[PDB]
Amino acid sequence: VETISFSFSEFEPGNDNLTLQGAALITQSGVLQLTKINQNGMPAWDSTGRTLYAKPVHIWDMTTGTVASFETRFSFSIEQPYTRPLPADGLVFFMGPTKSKPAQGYGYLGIFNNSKQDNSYQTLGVEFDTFSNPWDPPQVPHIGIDVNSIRSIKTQPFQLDNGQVANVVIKYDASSKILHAVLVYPSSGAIYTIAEIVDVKQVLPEWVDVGLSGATGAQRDAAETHDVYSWSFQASLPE
């Protein structure tokens, strides 16, 4: 049984277990800021940043047909300082081909290049979307399960508790093919749940990189923070 796991209770600047891309940065206080924060302390628009674990994960094997079960937990906060324009764009936990670089920002969240359902993306993602694009349901923010497309196969609206810490748990059970996610805000006690059937063998390559990506808007001040405080992950490929 191939098992892989990591747990960051906080982030250490300079650690070589995380690959920072784009605007992503680890502060001296141990916070992972996915998108840029200006010197005035305000979030910058037109910013895209990602953080990928430095080791690829064996998610499934063609030879045996076995598929791994996995679970990831992370805490983040989104702070929206301006009344107008509308804040954007969101953050997303994703799994895709190894050695990947940032894709298009804005509503594509740094992981897609367009709004098409393309099998060549080979990407699975759980988004926390803050801006309603034309391919989005009118309600924002919302949790969404993305399978080879920014056009989610399932969405769940949630109320943002501005600047408060949210706890996320995402679990994938290989035997049932159920991807289930939960978002909890300790501040208000709010609990949101979403689940859908996803056969990862039809989406992802055998080996994948796991990461977090965030993006701010295409127009001046259409922005918000995308700060991550902790992140853990475990995967077990049965054998």
Ligand X SMILES: OC[C@H]1O[C@H](O)[C@H](O)[C@@H](O)[C@H]1O
Ligand Y SMILES: *[C@@H]1O[C@H](CO)[C@@H](O[C@@H]2O[C@H](CO)[C@@H](O[C@@H]3O[C@H](CO[C@H]4O[C@H](CO)[C@@H](O)[C@H](O)[C@@H]4O)[C@@H](O)[C@H](O[C@H]4O[C@H](CO)[C@@H](O)[C@H](O)[C@@H]4O)[C@@H]3O[C@@H]3OC[C@@H](O)[C@H](O)[C@H]3O)[C@H](O)[C@H]2NC(C)=O)[C@H](O[C@@H]2O[C@@H](C)[C@@H](O)[C@@H](O)[C@@H]2O)[C@H]1NC(C)=O
Decide which of Ca ion, ligand Y, its own copies, none touches 139; Cβ closer than 5 to 8 Å per partner kind. none
* Residues 16-35, interacting with Ca ion (CB under 5 A): none
- Beta bridge pairs of residue 50: 21, 213
CB-wise, 112 or 229, nearer to Mn ion? 112
- Shortest distance (Å) from residue 235 CB to ligand Y: 13
> What is the token pair recorded at 104?
């298009």
Examine residue 17 and tell whether it contacts ligand Y (CB under 6 A). Answer: yes
Please choose, from the candidates 94, 184, 197, the residue with its C-alpha nearest in 3D space to the C-alpha of residue 154: 197
CB-wise, 67 or 126, nearer to Mn ion? 126
40 three-class SS: coil
Q: 165 vs 35, 114, 116, 226, CA distance in Å?
A: 17, 31, 32, 11
Q: State which H helix or E strand residue 188 sits in.
A: none
CB-wise, 165 or 218, nearer to ligand X? 218
> Would you tell me how many other CB atoms lie within 10 Å of the CB of residue 42?
15
113 three-class SS: coil
Q: What residue type is 186 in one-letter code?
A: P
- Shortest distance (Å) from residue 57 CB to ligand Y: 12
Which span sits near ligand X by CB under 6 A: 31-39, 190-198, 217-225, 231-239? 217-225
Residues that bind ligand X (CB under 6 A): 85, 88-89, 106-107, 131, 133, 217-219, 222
Report the interface residues with ligand Y, using CB under 6 A. Answer: 6, 16-17
